[PDB]
From a paper:
In contrast to D143A, the R232A variant shows significant changes in the active-site conformation, with residues 142–148 found in a completely different orientation compared with the WT structure. These structural alterations might cause the different space group of the crystal structure of R232A compared with WT KpDyP despite very similar crystallization conditions. The residues 142–148 form a loop that amounts to 50% of the solvent-exposed active site. The new loop conformation in R232A is stabilized on one side through two hydrogen bonds formed between Asp-143 and the nearby Arg-131 and one between Thr-135 and Arg-232 as well as on the other side by the change of Pro-148 from a trans- to a cis-conformation. In the crystal structure of R232A, Asp-143 is pointing away from the heme b cofactor, and the distance between the carboxylate oxygen and the heme iron increases from 5.0 to 8.9 Å. In addition, reorientation of the loop leads to the loss of the distal access channel, whereas both heme b propionates are completely solvent-exposed. Notably, the orientation of the propionate p7 also changes, most likely due to the missing salt bridge. Here, substitution of Arg-232 by alanine does not significantly influence the E°′ (−3 mV), which indicates that the loss of Arg-232 is compensated by loss of the negatively charged carboxylate group of Asp-143 that points away from the heme iron in R232A. Additionally, in the crystal structure of R232A, the side chain of Asp-143 points away from the heme iron. These data indicate that it is not reliable to discuss the role of Arg-232 in catalysis of Compound I formation in KpDyP based on the kinetic data of R232A. Elimination of Arg-232 increased KD (2700 ± 370 μm).
Author numbering:
A (entry chain A), B (entry chain B): 2 to 300
Amino acid sequence: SQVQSGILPEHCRAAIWIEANLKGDVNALREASKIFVDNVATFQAKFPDAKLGAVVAFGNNVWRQLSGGEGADELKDFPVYGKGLAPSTQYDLLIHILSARHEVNFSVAQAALAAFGDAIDVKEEIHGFRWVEERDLSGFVDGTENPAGEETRREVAVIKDGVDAGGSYVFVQRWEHNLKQLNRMSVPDQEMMIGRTKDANEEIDGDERPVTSHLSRVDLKEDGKGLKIVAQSLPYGTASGTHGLYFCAYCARLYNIEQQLLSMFGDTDGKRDAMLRFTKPVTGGYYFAPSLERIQALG
Amino acid sequence: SQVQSGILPEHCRAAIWIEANLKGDVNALREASKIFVDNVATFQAKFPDAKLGAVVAFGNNVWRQLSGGEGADELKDFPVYGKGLAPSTQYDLLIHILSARHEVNFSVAQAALAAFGDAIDVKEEIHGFRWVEERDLSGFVDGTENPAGEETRREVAVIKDGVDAGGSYVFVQRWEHNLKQLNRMSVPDQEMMIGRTKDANEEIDGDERPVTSHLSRVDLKEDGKGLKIVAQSLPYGTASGTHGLYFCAYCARLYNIEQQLLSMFGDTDGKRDAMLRFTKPVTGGYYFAPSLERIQALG
Ligand code: HEM
Ligand code: HEM
Ligand SMILES: [Mg+2]
């Protein structure tokens, strides 16, 4: 079984995320998905220098219908966390395109919309870009450097065995930064908020940083083993309007993502991520990315 | 007198255009402009390989005040053409940033917003990107290949003598494409609408192309000389939403631009550009870009 091309690539410079709801018969998504993954291969042959990859992923209700309720045991609608601090905007379909060339991404997105046609109603389209020094617009690194290498990324992100082998669970969440609130904080205070130094990205010891620091919120272990994810997040937005981070993560278990979200949004020990002092999430959704063989078998 | 850095560069991959109105005392724009052009030089030293350039330009009413009425003889508010076919959205300030790296442009745009601060109210911010094969989203080339080379571009765009030497007139106009309507047209009929062949961009002669073809509208002569411009246009937008071409042109005389517009929008010979069946302009403004020496002498 073969993983979809957009899950594991590293160092993408640009991405497009499209979120949409089904219109009408769910079975129309079968042929559209097949056309789209075939389009991706065609684009890869035409634009080898793009290093293009893409993912099509499905929300709970639609995937249960398409799969006859088989597998994807952990999949569910984004449930809201923090009594609303992390809202749910769950849709039926996610298209994630990433590469070294925004212009190729755009062409692929057009081909995706043409393949699904009237079977979908688009609700969100975000264009991500890698910023200077691979930093988040906060000035801290963007959180996607690790894990490095195909081998470890495959271990963290890709289901190993069973009917779902080669698949992955996907989480997307758009954040809106308020850089005016951020820049009122001294850099040392920002570093206690994140849990690493800002310029050199040197980790601050857990015993020396507050429990509300982002790293204390999301660096979680179970029986001494870290709950890791493969992040594909990128900055987005305009300088004079809305901007922030489009957070995107792939994982072989949704459990890892949920545990980090429960910790960040006050549903574990009661503490909340200190990053909420300058940025907030405004979307949230969970999706299942099947293997390429599984998509081809839809019809 | 030195030309602002964003006028002459060729083959930029990305740009940001910001249009803004003045808030409060017009004299605040004096030091702000000096700060911004100095920031641009600093960014150029930080990112030499990005081939960054930028332009600050002023609408008629503001420039007349800042220049004490000297020079800029042709400057005026952008008028409506074709009894509304081309609308007017004249603002006070234009900031144009271009380079090989969208991410560098974003940082320069943030520094621009800091430079002008509360002296401006931002009305528009457009992010342009070079599309595949330097084509407009219609599939035709994007109209910016010629004139090639610094010498010819300088002769076309940069005022040669007098108090304004080193300056340039600027015209910006955002177009919204309906690619569904274009897709209903056969490629031969698209080529008669543009005036050139689509894939090869081979000029179609005047004997065969209609006078309403775009080339027939804008390929104009005066006294044995072509009325040339230096176009910095780029595609913009989202696949599922609004997209098109952000048209941007520099010229040593506003006369050249206005003559082309009078032709396109029906005011010269009653005929209108055939492209209007699939794309329409929704903004429009004229600005004057002073020389760097002239900016430095504002305060
Ligand atoms: C505004 C949104 C966010 C920003 C700016 C951000 C930023 C960062 C930064 C600066 C780091 C440390 C850099 C590094 O990885 O070496 C990091 C690490 C990490 N982030 Fe975030 N993050 C955000 C949201 C999230 C969310 C929503 C999650 C999970 C649901 C998450 C999970 C993680 C994880 C697991 C790590 C690695 C922790 C470790 O093992 O050291 N982040 N992020
Ligand atoms: C949706 C908007 C537009 C599109 C898609 C478009 C497209 C094109 C194309 C395909 C060419 C020929 C390519 C080449 O040989 O370089 C061209 C040339 C040109 N365009 Fe446009 N254009 C647009 C708007 C405008 C506007 C608003 C103006 C001026 C007010 C303009 C002025 C010119 C000029 C002067 C030329 C060169 C003609 C020549 O000397 O052969 N264009 N444009
Ligand atoms: Mg003569």
